[PDB]
Design a protein around this ligand. Structure first.
Ligand SMILES: *[C@@H]1O[C@H](CO)[C@@H](O)[C@H](O)[C@H]1NC(C)=O
Ligand SMILES: *[C@@H]1O[C@H](CO)[C@@H](O)[C@H](O)[C@H]1NC(C)=O
Ligand SMILES: [K+]
Ligand SMILES: [K+]
Length: 321
């Protein structure tokens, strides 16, 4: 039994993975990325972001995004399209522009209409707005927030809904799994979009963790239910469990338990629709280039060989290992 087979047997829509264009020349890697027993869903890690899709104002480039979309379509995998609005990976014409509310609003809507229209009908989900919150649940400053104010959030959701009524529109963020101030502010963003009369269908919980900081399965279920209570779906969108190198048998076992708890929380929760890992092999993980001294965060090692966490994920989906 593979991870996606295990997931669908427990009522999830998918088990899936992010990938990135540079990795697709690695044939042993793509062979496993194309293994639909394990991966029912793909996220483009970078090539649908604003710097990749609109590198100058009004000029759209989809070649690299379409490689990932076409690979998912070729495999019959779902696509999570990622991400329209975010402080990071913006081109300089957005960050350095001389904007007014009106002109940046128009440029925002035009970006979203062009990208969402291009992929219309291809995207199970869109991450429409990514990481709009500071750690304390205030709004993260970015040029949209300083120019348009918090209205940029419902504006973005309304523009995506108009261009592709069939895509489920997500708000995506990290550290919501702890509850507290940041999760409360994520629920406030859901209510802001509903108050504005705009569509929002989901909250994405990225599930970037350091090993040993994942709470109990029941704690996670409670937090997921705090979002499904609002009438949105949830999903774990970018899961990884980073270890301060070097690894030991103890931290590999804790990593397995941590992944196991995360996927079982999704299995238990009505309205948690799926689970995505942020790539699948340590060879291509973002973690070392982001979290200094950390690594080995994923269920396959840098030689594409299963780690204990692969069986932890299966155990969290009720499979006898
Ligand atoms: C992976 O699947 C895609 C989509 O069907 C296909 O284009 C590609 O050739 C496959 N690659 C390998 C190594 O199987
Ligand atoms: C920008 O315009 C929208 C639409 O009127 C409005 O909701 C929002 O509050 C404005 N923001 C600022 C900072 O003026
Ligand atoms: K579920
Ligand atoms: K990568």
């Amino acid at each position: 039994v593979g991870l996606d087979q295990a997931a669908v047997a427990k009522g999830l829509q998918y088990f899936g993975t992010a990938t990135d264009n540079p990795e697709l020349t690695d044939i042993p890697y793509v062979t496993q990325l194309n293994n639909t027993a394990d991966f029912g869903q793909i996220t483009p890690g970078n090539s649908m972001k604003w710097d990749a899709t609109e590198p100058s104002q009004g000029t759209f480039t989809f070649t690299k995004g379409d490689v990932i979309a076409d690979l998912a379509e070729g495999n019959g995998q779902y696509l999570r399209c990622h991400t329209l609005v975010w402080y990071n990976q913006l081109p300089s014409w957005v960050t350095s522009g001389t904007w007014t509310n009106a002109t940046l609003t128009a440029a925002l809507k035009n970006h979203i209409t062009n990208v969402v229209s291009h992929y219309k009908g291809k995207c199970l989900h869109w991450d429409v707005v990514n990481e709009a919150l500071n750690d304390d649940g205030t709004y993260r400053t970015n040029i949209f927030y300083t120019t348009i104010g918090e209205a940029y959030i419902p504006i973005a959701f309304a523009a995506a809904a108009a261009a592709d009524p069939d895509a489920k529109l997500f708000y995506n963020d990290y550290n919501l799994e702890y509850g507290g101030a940041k999760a409360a502010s994520a629920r406030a963003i859901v209510q802001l979009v509903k108050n504005a009369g705009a569509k929002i269908d989901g909250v994405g919980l990225q599930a970037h963790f350091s090993v040993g900081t994942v709470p109990s399965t029941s704690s996670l279920v409670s937090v997921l239910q705090s979002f499904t209570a609002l009438g949105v779906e949830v999903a774990y969108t970018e899961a990884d469990v980073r270890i301060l190198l070097p690894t030991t048998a103890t931290t590999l076992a804790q990593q397995s338990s941590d992944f196991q708890a995360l996927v079982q929380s999704c299995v238990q929760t009505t309205g948690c629709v799926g689970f995505t890992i942020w790539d699948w092999t340590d060879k291509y993980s973002w973690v070392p280039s982001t979290f200094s001294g950390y690594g080995a965060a994923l269920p396959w090692d840098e030689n594409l060989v299963k780690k204990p966490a692969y069986n932890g994920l299966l155990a969290g989906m009720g499979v006898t290992v």
